[PDB]
Design a protein around this ligand. Structure first.
Ligand SMILES: Nc1ncnc2c1ncn2[C@@H]1O[C@H](COP(=O)(O)O)[C@@H](O)[C@H]1O
Ligand SMILES: Nc1ncnc2c1ncn2[C@@H]1O[C@H](COP(=O)(O)O)[C@@H](O)[C@H]1O
Lengths: 420, 421
């Protein structure tokens, strides 16, 4: 019989998922493989019922995939249902795969999607490969080299903020833009720098391993006041949602409205419910609205996951999908498909999943780097040297209707809070 | 006295010129420099008259540059007027640069623009010259894959234009022959074609022989059409690099400009811009294939890409180039080019980028031996070496073109020796 290749998506979508599906499917079909796609990740595979999976499994033919490289989202949907936890759920998945005569199993998704594939992984009977998916640019790819979907997300964010930059200057106002995603500051920083935003704050720039609510308020506050000292009572500040995952007990308590933070049954805090931008706007309007400043929060997140892929991501995901089929052919299994140095190569599971955490390592922003310093130079902010500038402190202090003494007492310490 | 930074653009525009302008201007202003922008490149500096120059130079203030990083084009315009030739013109350009107290001089442009900048350097510690390599074509000798600024914006817009044409050609069955402007290299054409899933792309790099024949290009497109026809599809999109023309033989060019002699500029320099490659191919192919019910339409993609607003990748890129230029002036550099390699912006020295024979910066073509190119080929529709040996397939494609399999092989099988496999 003709070998069967089964494909699914797990976790949250990123632009280009359809590109991976098509890159693997079209090439597979050129070899005479039957391709099937599982709807909603492992959701229905975890049940083990064969006719339930068949009913949520589709034939991925030429016509179905021929033009989805233009399309955001995933045509086979996705789910966060991961069997990684239970030994039984795993057995249920294998039963359906074997019943479907799946010879080649391809998963596209995040950390939990790959752990599911490895737990479910007879290399001659099957072969399993995951394609690491993250919009956040936080794979340990050789620094600079992006993860797929990141270019699409950064570009669309840049366009959204451009409109906000025009609206903020046209009708003076500050926007606090919350960039969804707590893993890393790549998306926040890229949108901000691309767009020329007047400030960006990411968790990586804070020296201390923990962040205080009031230091974030004061960081944005000083920028507003400096801009105001230059006659501009408007701007745009981009905040990475990860700021909240680095906040202290007390800080988190202020963030949730000076109330005990919400809690899941196991004690793990439910950080999704926080509203970092809405909170900072509240506090800032208290301190600053008496100067003629208006402040409005704005979230950017969900509109980015399924935007149509930009051309870089189109080419990227076509090469990733092809590279999956090449790994399958050349006998690989239990490996991850990544592009490093213009080559798509299967990096083995062990050789890329950090066994300490039991998960692929996280690439954060490098704030010691030349790139980060350049971005900082076009932001509006109070540097160390700025604070030691008697004449400058006099104008910004005047801007905020306070003495130069109070200004230094309040803000000068921030040089020790974030890297210079 | 505050130092004077002078800026100008030469050559054709590429998305992100304003990004470089603003990246450098804003940082220079954070240091207290005066910054001026010469309008239309070297056009008004070659004259040497200082009143006329003063008229076509502007003060690059904070408010002029603060938001242009969103904007395509160049706010100080550009020009191909290169003083690289006559030594009189070069003393004139230097009389105004020295008359304006221009301490630092930044040019943004291509080969002729940098060749111009260098020649005027060869001038006392009173001036320091730097050029910023610009090309939409991606043909700078940067480490492989790494792009020149403007390429991403151009490739992306091209993918969007071709997407519309892909929908149109399938909705109302038709073939489009898209001509991607630029004869330097195949990067732009291949990138647009691959991102868009175009059914064929043809670039000069993929042809083995130094020279190309008109009839080989026709037949390459013809085989793809016929193969799609044999799979039920009388429609598609084919992307062509305009650089096919610069590789054509005398006999090929003779057929391209009609069946006449090619036009010549004085001194024999052929006038290749007048060619209409995709229109010519479209003519010939409708002679051969129209009886099969095939419609074929040329479409050029080119000028709409030069001044598109830059995508985020290019906004960041040009911000970093503009910063890196100021940082280089500050460190006492001069006679250098600003490039980004391995994520760092560094001033490569001009002597270490200029090929000897050509005198200009090494040209980086498409690497057709790479995995990248092979991957792009697999999603194209075409007859491979193996396909020509497949008997059942050759019988289907020949029937689609209403010929015997022997007439099909005699006409097309030799194309496996024309382009790399
Ligand atoms: N934090 C900042 N970020 C970007 N530009 C600034 C900043 N502070 C001042 N500028 C600009 O830098 C230039 C120098 O201003 P001054 O400090 O008055 O010499 C002016 O164009 C200011 O608007
Ligand atoms: N040159 C080509 N490029 C891309 N796909 C092709 C090409 N030729 C055939 N196909 C597709 O490959 C699959 C298998 O073709 P076949 O070998 O005829 O079964 C079908 O979906 C065809 O439409």
């Amino acid at each position: 019989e003709a070998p069967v290749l089964g494909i699914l998506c797990g976790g949250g979508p990123a632009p280009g998922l359809n590109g991976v599906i098509a890159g693997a499917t079209l090439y597979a079909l050129r070899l005479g493989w039957k391709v099937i796609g599982f709807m909603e990740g492992f959701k229905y595979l975890c049940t083990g019922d064969v006719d339930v999976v068949k009913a949520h499994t589709i034939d991925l033919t030429y016509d179905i995939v021929s033009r989805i490289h233009f399309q955001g989202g995933t045509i086979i949907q996705t789910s966060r249902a991961n069997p990684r936890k239970s030994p039984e759920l795993q057995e249920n998945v294998r039963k359906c795969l074997r019943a479907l005569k799946v010879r080649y199993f391809l998963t596209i998704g995040g950390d939990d999607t790959a752990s599911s594939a490895v737990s479910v992984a007879n290399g001659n009977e099957i072969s399993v490969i995951s394609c690491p998916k993250t919009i956040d640019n936080d794979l340990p790819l050789p620094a600079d080299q992006s993860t797929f979907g990141f270019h699409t997300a950064r570009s669309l964010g840049m366009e959204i903020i451009r409109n906000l930059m025009v609206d903020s200057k046209s009708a003076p106002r500050w926007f606090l833009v919350e960039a969804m995603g707590r893993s890393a500051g790549h998306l926040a920083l890229g949108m901000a720098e691309a767009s020329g935003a007047h400030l960006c704050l990411i968790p990586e720039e804070f020296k201390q391993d923990e962040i205080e609510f009031e230091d974030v308020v004061e960081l944005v506050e000083a920028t507003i006041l400096k801009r105001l000292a230059y006659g501009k009572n408007y701007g745009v500040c981009v905040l990475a949602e990860g700021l909240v995952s680095k906040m202290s007990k007390k800080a988190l308590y202020k963030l949730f409205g000076n109330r005990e933070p919400p809690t899941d049954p196991h004690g793990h805090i439910l950080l999704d419910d926080a509203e970092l931008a809405r909170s900072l706007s509240e506090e800032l309007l208290k301190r600053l609205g008496n100067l003629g400043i208006r402040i409005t929060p704005k979230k950017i997140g969900y509109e980015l996951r399924c935007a149509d892929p930009v051309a870089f991501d189109a080419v990227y995901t076509r090469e990733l999908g092809y590279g999956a089929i090449d790994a399958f052919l050349n006998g690989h299994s239990a490996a991850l498909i990544v592009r490093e140095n213009g080559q798509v190569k299967p990096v083995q599971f062990k050789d890329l999943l950090d066994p300490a955490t039991g998960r692929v390592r996280t690439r954060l922003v490098d704030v010691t780097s030349q790139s980060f310093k350049v971005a900082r130079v076009y932001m509006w902010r109070m540097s160390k040297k700025d604070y030691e500038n008697k004449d400058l402190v006099a104008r910004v202090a005047a801007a905020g209707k306070m003495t130069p003494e109070a200004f230094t007492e309040k803000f000068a310490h921030l040089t020790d809070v974030v890297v210079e």
